[PDB]
Ligand SMILES: Nc1ncnc2c1ncn2[C@@H]1O[C@H](COP(=O)(O)OP(=O)(O)OP(=O)(O)O)[C@@H](O)[C@H]1O
């Protein structure tokens with residue numbers, strides 16, 4: 001059945017060094033031992049396995065490599081969603097056509113037939129727990145029955161192997177995972193350092209063989225820089241780097257006098273890697289640098305001590321979350337008066353944290369959604385956050401997320417309960433998390449018994465003295481010395497209570513008049529606005 | 534043999550360690566069948582899905598000659614919120630019907646509860662179903678606090694002596710999990726300023742019963 005034309009090195013899989021050893025020991029330890037002993041023991045072969053993990057980490061590759069290694073026939077790749085049909089009896093026919101060749105060859109060549117391999121993709125899109133209550137049957141009760149009957153029925157097949165692949169392993173039936181049916185489970189996770197080195201070596205072997213690499217390309221660096229890259233986004237990086245190198249070469253010669261031999265020598269690639277890494281690849285489980293422009297519009301500018309106090313508190317919380325081991329889950333709430341700029345400080349803490357995973361959950365992308373969809377979105381974000389050795393998630397404008405309105409009061413309970421349950425669920429073993437929240441109405445949250453779930457509170461104050469306002473104006477740099485002195489004389493009284501956002505709006509508005517009438521309008525607007533709580 | 538079904542409720546204040554004690558009582562019983570029905574595996578479910586999940590767990594429990602089922606965080610299952618009040622009637626009725634349904638002949642069961650709000654559960658006429666209740670208290674003395682500090686093994690001798698003087702002359706109403714949180718949050722300062730921060734946090738947290 002097996003021939004010596006297979007070696008592990010030639011396969012080309014890097015990072016799965018246990019997910020293969022254990023599989024080989026368990027599933028395929030009876031397909032290689034001499035037939036005499038196996039027959040004497042009288043043991044049946046395993047009839048399939050299940051692979052789960054994030055998307056794009058090398059599961060299909062492993063299935064095809066197993067198929068080639070076992071000297072099987074051509075696998076019948078299938079797609080889960082493309083089996084269903086709207087007529088009465090068409091889905092079951094599609095599920096039944098796959099098991100035809102094995103049945104035909106089992107009754108003709110006796111017990112000396114080949115090995116047929118069947119591959120399912122997204123196996124959980126068809127098989128879901130079957131209802132129990134009378135009249136509570138689902139719409140896909142018939143597909144599951146057909147699949148169960150075919151895999152292990154009254155007529156025995158001993159020349160088949162079934163591989164299933166899925167991402168959500170908690171929705172599959174429970175009679176489809178017992179010893180005899182799919183009975184071996186393995187997990188394919190994100191690669192680690194020594195798993196991101198092997199992939200790069202495998203992918204640059206070709207360039208090294210054909211003598212295209214430069215003399216300064218260091219692979220330890222490239223292994224270190226990419227932190228949460230999945231296996232499918234390193235080949236993209238390599239190819240993008242080579243493509244930009246070629247583009248540079250071509251456009252150079254046309255507007256350069258390099259020379260043909262000079263161009264060939266220039267074909268080497270050293271910094272294209274760095275440039276492409278910077279501005280070509282966007283990971284799916286990594287920090288995003290494109291959002292901090294949307295939430296930090298005018299940057300953080302100091303106008304007092306409270307800014308420093310808040311930032312230091314955030315730093316201490318980050319340190320605690322990183323180092324301690326008795327408490328792997330931490331939380332904190334930022335609350336203050338409206339227009340005080342809380343989201344900006346939350347984003348600043350998150351971005352200065354230096355964590356591999358950073359994400360922001362906000363209602364800006366949830367216009368028109370029904371509560372159930374909002375629950376699904378929140379759960380998806382947290383599920384993606386549970387797949388890293390460090391992380392941090394920010395929840396914005398909790399009151400807007402609950403659909404609150406003072407009349408009534410009226411709000412939604414499903415979202416509140418989901419949120420109150422997701423603040424106390426610890427991650428898998430050995431991983432850490434950090435959750436930040438922002439709100440303006442703390443008392444309403446206090447009534448909802450949602451304020452003691454968080455582990456700490458931080459106050460974001462408001463401008464409260466004239467000198468602070470003058471210093472903020474100086475930092476902004478709009479009004480000249482004489483105008484500043486006039487304002488200082490006018491507003492020397494320390495009775496100012498204004499938000500840093502309303503102040504920017506006021507300054508922008510007041511600059512729409514002639515130079516003569518500038519200070520008067522600004523002072524009139526400031527006086528008209530509230531002067532105390 | 535007269536009573537093939539029993540129930541019990543563990544209740545106390547928040548942050549006191551009810552789930553841990555329920556799990557430890559369940560683990561040391563050597564029952565062939567043990568299971569836990571928690572609400573963190575039911576995020577986003579509607580009423581009927583929760584009913585079906587509970588019913589399935591009990592149906593499975595009814596097929597062993599001995600059993601033990603744990604139902605924790607009862608108030609999160611009912612979706613309770615003081616404003617209103619609001620909650621789910623269907624789940625409440627399902628639970629109240631399942632609490633007093635004997636298994637087939639010859640088989641035995643045991644149900645353990647958990648909750649931090651006993652009065653609310655009493656308003657709905659639910660403490661009538663449970664056979665009896667147990668009380669889990671907090672730390673309510675300086676001596677017990679010192680014993681807990683010694684057993685956790687964090688602060689050294691001299692710092693222990695410093696803590697002793699400022700604590701024995703008052704009372705304390707801190708839970709046990711919150712104590713771990715405070716100890717962890719204090720150790721992030723420089724060697725000199727650890728005891729001061731711990732005392733400040735403890736004084737802030739402490740409140741009358
Ligand atoms: N020291 C500062 N702190 C916060 N924001 C600042 C500071 N200096 C400048 N800003 C700018 O102020 C704006 C902060 O607005 P932001 O959206 O954070 O307000 P908010 O308090 O969250 O709003 P809302 O009233 O809608 O809740 C951003 O443009 C930020 O760049």
Ligand SMILES: Nc1ncnc2c1ncn2[C@@H]1O[C@H](COP(=O)(O)OP(=O)(O)OP(=O)(O)O)[C@@H](O)[C@H]1O
Pocket residue numbers: 546547548549550551552553554649709710
């Ligand atoms: N003697 C003890 N009793 C209970 N828990 C203890 C004890 N010693 C240490 N612990 C630990 O304290 C923590 C108690 O947290 P736990 O989840 O049990 O609290 P809880 O009562 O369920 O809280 P909540 O009020 O939030 O529902 C667990 O880590 C438990 O291991």
Ligand SMILES: Nc1ncnc2c1ncn2[C@@H]1O[C@H](COP(=O)(O)OP(=O)(O)O)[C@@H](O)[C@H]1O
Pocket residue numbers: 012013014015016054055056057058059060061199202231232235
């Ligand atoms: N362990 C690995 N070693 C080498 N390449 C990998 C590995 N995992 C994933 N890849 C890359 O991923 C690509 C295909 O992945 P794919 O089969 O789509 O993953 P999945 O089946 O999980 O969607 C290939 O081009 C391959 O280079």
